[PDB]
Amino acid sequence: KILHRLLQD
Amino acid sequence: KHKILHRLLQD
Amino acid sequence: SLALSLTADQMVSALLDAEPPILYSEYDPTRPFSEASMMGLLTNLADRELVHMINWAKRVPGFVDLTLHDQVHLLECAWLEILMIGLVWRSMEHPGKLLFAPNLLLDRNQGKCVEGMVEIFDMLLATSSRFRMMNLQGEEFVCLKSIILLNSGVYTFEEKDHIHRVLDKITDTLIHLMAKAGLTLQQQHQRLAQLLLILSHIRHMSNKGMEHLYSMKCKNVVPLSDLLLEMLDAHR
Amino acid sequence: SLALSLTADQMVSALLDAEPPILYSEYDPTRPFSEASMMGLLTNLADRELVHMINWAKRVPGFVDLTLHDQVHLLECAWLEILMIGLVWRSMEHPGKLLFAPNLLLDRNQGKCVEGMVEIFDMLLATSSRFRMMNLQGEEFVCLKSIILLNSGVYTFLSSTLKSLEEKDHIHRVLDKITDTLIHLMAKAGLTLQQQHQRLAQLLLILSHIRHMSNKGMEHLYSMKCKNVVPLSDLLLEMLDAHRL
Ligand SMILES: CCc1c2cc(O)ccc2nn1-c1ccc(O)cc1
Ligand SMILES: CCc1c2cc(O)ccc2nn1-c1ccc(O)cc1
């Protein structure tokens, strides 16, 4: 999940 | 031209 | 215009008086459900409630000042929101169930009797639970329902100005009820916001409900009344 | 939660500093619009705006206190409402037009290039008009945009006792803080006590219209996707698919 990864930054 | 809502409202 | 001069107490009285009756469903509770029967029950009910809603609207202060065309636009835009906030309100004291009618109280799981329905049930119940945790009062509820009627279709239109004036009066009414209930100014504004933000979720549900209703019609899982088809048609 | 301890002035200042940039579209102004090309511009833009939105969301007080799962659900629920309220804000000073980007300013007739679009354009335009009538201020705008982020998805949570409930509580504490902040701004602006509650209501009722617009735009975007009008990025696909499950 892309949204999930982006939030982790 | 003859919507039911129209005639229900004008009562 | 006469609605602009009502007092806060007199707005409540009027709204309380205008309340539609609680309708029963036809449901014969000696036989279990099918997908077709449940949906038939829901639409038969909504169709009867719509007739009462039109009567109720005409009794909402300021509504009758609007042109017939404007009145129609508002009801077409808001009808399912109005039915749903009604449903949410009477289900308030039945955690986990939706009281569509006194003899049709459906727990969460019976939404699975109809494809796609449980997602909408879940939203409805979550809203009921919210009402419960806020301890929504009946006087507040009737204010909220009238706001939906006046607000929902207003931006899709002097006619606009009057609606916003009446909307202001109902805001005045809600705050009056909260002041009367002993809330501080800070608590009053916080509760006003909380209540109005629920209207966003109610809109969401209406929109979802409308597409579901449309799907059930195309898939022909149940015949709909002429009036209900017409209220459906207005959104597409 | 240090965020619960913020003053109204600290809330406003934090929200203002979190504001994402105004992006440019990849519009080549000497090429003829098609339905496909206009949809491409809007979805290319949205995709780039989403990455900036995520970093903004992290900067809204209280948002980083929530779990990763809940941050996701909230952004998944509200992403299009947030893009649209931004658009309506950017368009405030351009009656009759939608400022999608400084190099992409469209009127309703240009919306007709894409089937079903003009109806959405019209709702966005009317929202822009309402913003103008109300004389919406940037400090009020940023509060509203933050309310949408926190509220839109807040009831699509479930309930696992303390776990889900306290995430819900927290969100409502923060929402209550933004209310206090909104009121504060209107008082500092000299509005009367009566005007304060009246305006607070007028502003929050707009959110019901923004939800409506997001619901219809999501339907419309789904339709363009299902008709192979435009390729969506994986991000946009994921954001859209969250509304079909
Ligand atoms: C319009 C009847 C109806 C629904 C149709 C759907 O496809 C999905 C959910 C529905 N709920 N209702 C409904 C809502 C409130 C009432 O008082 C009666 C029926
Ligand atoms: C999410 C991209 C988008 C749309 C998709 C549609 O199918 C219809 C209308 C749309 N508007 N927008 C949009 C809105 C605000 C932005 O900042 C970027 C794109």
Side-chain angles (χ1 to χ4, degrees), chain D residues 39 42 45-46 49 79-80 83 87 90 100 117 217 220-221:
Chain D
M39 278 307 306
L42 308 193
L45 183 67
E49 288 187 281
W79 68 275
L80 188 59
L83 293 180
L87 171 60
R90 290 198 295 281
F100 281 89
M117 179 72 79
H220 180 270
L221 179 50

Short mmCIF file of all heavy atoms in Angstrom, two decimals, chain D residues 39 42 45-46 49 79-80 83 87 90 100 117 217 220-221, ligand 2:
data_model
loop_
_atom_site.label_atom_id
_atom_site.label_comp_id
_atom_site.label_asym_id
_atom_site.label_seq_id
_atom_site.Cartn_x
_atom_site.Cartn_y
_atom_site.Cartn_z
N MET D 39 -8.77 15.12 -18.38
CA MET D 39 -8.76 14.20 -17.24
C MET D 39 -7.33 13.87 -16.79
O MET D 39 -7.06 13.75 -15.60
CB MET D 39 -9.54 12.92 -17.54
CG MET D 39 -11.05 13.04 -17.35
SD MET D 39 -11.60 13.68 -15.73
CE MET D 39 -10.78 12.59 -14.56
N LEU D 42 -5.98 16.77 -14.62
CA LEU D 42 -6.56 16.79 -13.29
C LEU D 42 -6.01 15.66 -12.41
O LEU D 42 -5.71 15.88 -11.25
CB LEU D 42 -8.09 16.74 -13.35
CG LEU D 42 -8.84 17.73 -14.24
CD1 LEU D 42 -10.32 17.72 -13.89
CD2 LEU D 42 -8.29 19.13 -14.12
N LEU D 45 -2.13 16.24 -11.63
CA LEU D 45 -2.13 17.24 -10.56
C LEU D 45 -2.48 16.68 -9.17
O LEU D 45 -1.74 16.86 -8.19
CB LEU D 45 -3.09 18.37 -10.93
CG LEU D 45 -3.13 19.53 -9.93
CD1 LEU D 45 -1.79 20.25 -9.95
CD2 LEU D 45 -4.24 20.49 -10.25
N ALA D 46 -3.62 16.00 -9.10
CA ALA D 46 -4.08 15.37 -7.87
C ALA D 46 -3.01 14.45 -7.31
O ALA D 46 -2.75 14.47 -6.11
CB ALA D 46 -5.38 14.58 -8.12
N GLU D 49 -0.32 16.43 -5.76
CA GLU D 49 -0.87 17.12 -4.59
C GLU D 49 -1.01 16.17 -3.41
O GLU D 49 -0.83 16.58 -2.26
CB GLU D 49 -2.22 17.76 -4.89
CG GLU D 49 -2.18 18.99 -5.79
CD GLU D 49 -3.55 19.62 -5.86
OE1 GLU D 49 -4.41 19.12 -6.62
OE2 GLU D 49 -3.79 20.61 -5.15
N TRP D 79 -9.42 12.39 1.19
CA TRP D 79 -8.46 12.98 0.25
C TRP D 79 -9.12 13.91 -0.78
O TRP D 79 -8.60 14.97 -1.06
CB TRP D 79 -7.63 11.90 -0.46
CG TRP D 79 -8.39 11.02 -1.42
CD1 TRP D 79 -9.09 9.89 -1.11
CD2 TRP D 79 -8.49 11.18 -2.84
NE1 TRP D 79 -9.63 9.34 -2.26
CE2 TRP D 79 -9.28 10.12 -3.33
CE3 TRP D 79 -8.00 12.13 -3.75
CZ2 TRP D 79 -9.60 9.98 -4.69
CZ3 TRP D 79 -8.30 11.98 -5.09
CH2 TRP D 79 -9.10 10.91 -5.55
N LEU D 80 -10.24 13.49 -1.36
CA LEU D 80 -10.86 14.29 -2.42
C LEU D 80 -11.60 15.51 -1.88
O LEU D 80 -11.61 16.56 -2.52
CB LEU D 80 -11.78 13.44 -3.31
CG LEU D 80 -12.32 14.14 -4.58
CD1 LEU D 80 -11.20 14.63 -5.50
CD2 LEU D 80 -13.27 13.23 -5.37
N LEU D 83 -8.73 18.00 -1.46
CA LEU D 83 -8.30 18.58 -2.74
C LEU D 83 -9.34 19.59 -3.22
O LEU D 83 -8.99 20.67 -3.65
CB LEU D 83 -8.08 17.50 -3.82
CG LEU D 83 -6.93 16.50 -3.65
CD1 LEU D 83 -6.92 15.53 -4.82
CD2 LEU D 83 -5.59 17.19 -3.56
N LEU D 87 -9.16 23.63 -3.91
CA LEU D 87 -9.51 24.18 -5.22
C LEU D 87 -10.49 25.35 -5.08
O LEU D 87 -10.33 26.40 -5.69
CB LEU D 87 -10.12 23.08 -6.09
CG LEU D 87 -10.76 23.44 -7.43
CD1 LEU D 87 -9.76 24.08 -8.35
CD2 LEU D 87 -11.42 22.22 -8.07
N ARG D 90 -8.67 28.36 -3.76
CA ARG D 90 -7.79 28.96 -4.77
C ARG D 90 -8.60 29.75 -5.78
O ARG D 90 -8.08 30.65 -6.44
CB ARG D 90 -7.01 27.88 -5.52
CG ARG D 90 -5.95 27.19 -4.72
CD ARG D 90 -4.96 26.48 -5.63
NE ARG D 90 -5.57 25.38 -6.37
CZ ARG D 90 -5.83 24.18 -5.86
NH1 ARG D 90 -5.55 23.93 -4.60
NH2 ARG D 90 -6.37 23.23 -6.61
N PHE D 100 -7.48 25.28 -10.81
CA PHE D 100 -6.88 23.99 -10.49
C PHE D 100 -5.39 24.18 -10.24
O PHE D 100 -4.82 23.58 -9.34
CB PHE D 100 -7.11 22.97 -11.64
CG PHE D 100 -8.49 22.36 -11.63
CD1 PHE D 100 -9.53 22.95 -12.31
CD2 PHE D 100 -8.74 21.21 -10.92
CE1 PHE D 100 -10.82 22.38 -12.29
CE2 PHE D 100 -10.01 20.63 -10.90
CZ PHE D 100 -11.05 21.24 -11.59
N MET D 117 -18.59 16.07 -16.22
CA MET D 117 -17.73 16.93 -15.42
C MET D 117 -18.40 18.25 -15.06
O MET D 117 -18.24 18.75 -13.96
CB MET D 117 -16.40 17.20 -16.12
CG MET D 117 -15.51 18.13 -15.31
SD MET D 117 -14.83 17.32 -13.84
CE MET D 117 -13.50 16.37 -14.58
N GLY D 217 -17.69 13.38 -7.29
CA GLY D 217 -16.41 13.34 -8.01
C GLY D 217 -15.76 11.96 -7.98
O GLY D 217 -15.10 11.53 -8.94
N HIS D 220 -17.54 9.96 -10.40
CA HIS D 220 -17.15 10.40 -11.73
C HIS D 220 -15.76 9.89 -12.12
O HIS D 220 -15.50 9.50 -13.28
CB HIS D 220 -17.16 11.92 -11.81
CG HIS D 220 -16.76 12.44 -13.15
ND1 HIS D 220 -15.45 12.72 -13.48
CD2 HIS D 220 -17.49 12.70 -14.25
CE1 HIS D 220 -15.40 13.15 -14.73
NE2 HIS D 220 -16.63 13.15 -15.22
N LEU D 221 -14.86 9.91 -11.14
CA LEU D 221 -13.50 9.41 -11.33
C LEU D 221 -13.52 7.91 -11.58
O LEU D 221 -12.79 7.40 -12.44
CB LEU D 221 -12.63 9.77 -10.13
CG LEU D 221 -11.18 9.31 -10.15
CD1 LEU D 221 -10.50 9.69 -11.46
CD2 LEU D 221 -10.43 9.90 -8.96
C1 LIG E 2 -8.95 13.98 -7.99
C2 LIG E 2 -8.77 14.69 -9.31
C3 LIG E 2 -10.01 15.53 -9.59
C4 LIG E 2 -11.16 15.07 -10.22
C5 LIG E 2 -11.56 13.83 -10.75
C6 LIG E 2 -12.83 13.72 -11.34
O1 LIG E 2 -13.24 12.55 -11.87
C7 LIG E 2 -13.66 14.84 -11.38
C8 LIG E 2 -13.25 16.06 -10.85
C9 LIG E 2 -11.99 16.18 -10.26
N1 LIG E 2 -11.33 17.20 -9.68
N2 LIG E 2 -10.20 16.83 -9.31
C10 LIG E 2 -9.30 17.63 -8.67
C11 LIG E 2 -9.73 18.49 -7.67
C12 LIG E 2 -8.82 19.30 -6.99
C13 LIG E 2 -7.46 19.25 -7.29
O2 LIG E 2 -6.66 19.97 -6.68
C14 LIG E 2 -7.01 18.37 -8.27
C15 LIG E 2 -7.94 17.58 -8.96
#
